[PDB]
Swiss-Prot record:
ADP-D-ribose binds at residues 13, 27, 35, 115-117. This is Non-structural protein 3. It comes from the Viruses. The chain holds residues 1334 to 1493 of 2474 of the full protein. Interacts with mRNA-capping enzyme nsP1. Interacts (via C-terminus) with host G3BP1; this interaction inhibits the formation of host stress granules on viral mRNAs and the nsp3-G3BP1 complexes bind viral RNAs and probably orchestrate the assembly of viral replication complexes. Interacts (via C-terminus) with host G3BP2; this interaction inhibits the formation of host stress granules on viral mRNAs and the nsp3-G3BP2 complexes bind viral RNAs and probably orchestrate the assembly of viral replication complexes. Interacts (via C-terminus) with host NAP1L1. It is found in: Host cytoplasmic vesicle membrane. In the N-terminus, the macro domain displays a mono-ADP-ribosylhydrolase activity. The central part called, the alphavirus unique domain (AUD) has a zinc-binding function. The C-terminus region, also called hypervariable domain (HVD), is mainly disordered and binds several host proteins. This intrinsically disordered domain contains 2 SH3 domain-binding sites and 2 FGDF motifs necessary and sufficient for the formation of nsP3/G3BP complexes. Seems to be essential for minus-strand RNAs and subgenomic 26S mRNAs synthesis. Displays mono-ADP-ribosylhydrolase activity. ADP-ribosylation is a post-translational modification that controls various processes of the host cell and the virus probably needs to revert it for optimal viral replication. Binds proteins of G3BP family and sequesters them into the viral RNA replication complexes thereby inhibiting the formation of host stress granules on viral mRNAs. Residues 4-163 form the Macro domain. It is a peripheral membrane protein. It comes from Chikungunya virus (strain S27-African prototype). Disulfide bonds: none annotated. Changing residue 36 to A: Partial loss of mono-ADP-ribosylhydrolase activity. Changing residue 36 to E/F: Almost complete loss of mono-ADP-ribosylhydrolase activity. Phosphorylated by host on serines and threonines.
């Protein structure tokens, strides 16, 4: 575990993280995809061997000794708000199980279902609050990766509000 487990946010490519493992915002079929998933595929392509897994689950595949946790958030274009919310909470609970099992002291995480799976809605608060529900009981240092400057400010404020 980390000496004083923390949350941080960085505005940069998660493929350049400084943590002991990475969470991929994966698709259920293990395909290269786009956004976070394509960056992860370019950096750790070996991790996409038998990475296919259902919505609401997470599957870990090694790239050398570096773990890639493929977490499959719902596509809100396809799910009801209610069913999508349940699957999004579930995907993060499965990430917390994998981070615990791996014994890592740190993890790089994106906000699941906030990009092309958002069904065109702003889901920053929804996705972040499900990330906290899952990860609060883990002792890894969590570093949240985003692209947008306004999202960085909002995520930082949400972290700071609990401190
Ligand atoms: C956190 C993160 N990493 C990315 C890589 C490519 C595109 C969007 C991304 N967002
Ligand atoms: Cl970057
Ligand atoms: Cl997404
Ligand atoms: Cl973002």
């Amino acid at each position: 575990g980390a000496m004083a487990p923390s949350y941080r946010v960085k505005r940069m490519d998660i493929a350049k993280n400084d943590e002991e493992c990475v969470v991929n915002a994966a698709n259920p079929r293990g395909l290269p995809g786009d956004g976070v998933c394509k960056a992860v595929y370019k950096k750790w392509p070996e991790s996409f061997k038998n990475s296919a897994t259902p919505v609401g689950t997470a599957k870990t595949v090694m790239c050398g000794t570096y773990p890639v946790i493929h977490a499959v958030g719902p596509n809100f274009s396809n799910y009801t708000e209610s069913e999508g919310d349940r699957e999004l909470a579930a995907a993060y609970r499965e990430v917390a199980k994998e981070v615990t099992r791996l014994g890592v002291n740190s993890v790089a995480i994106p906000l699941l279902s906030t990009g092309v799976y958002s069904g065109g809605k702003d889901r920053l608060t929804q996705s972040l609050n499900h990330l906290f529900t899952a990860m609060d009981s883990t002792d890894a240092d969590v570093v949240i990766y985003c692209r947008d400057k306004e999202w960085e400010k909002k995520i930082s404020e949400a972290i700071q509000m609990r401190t």
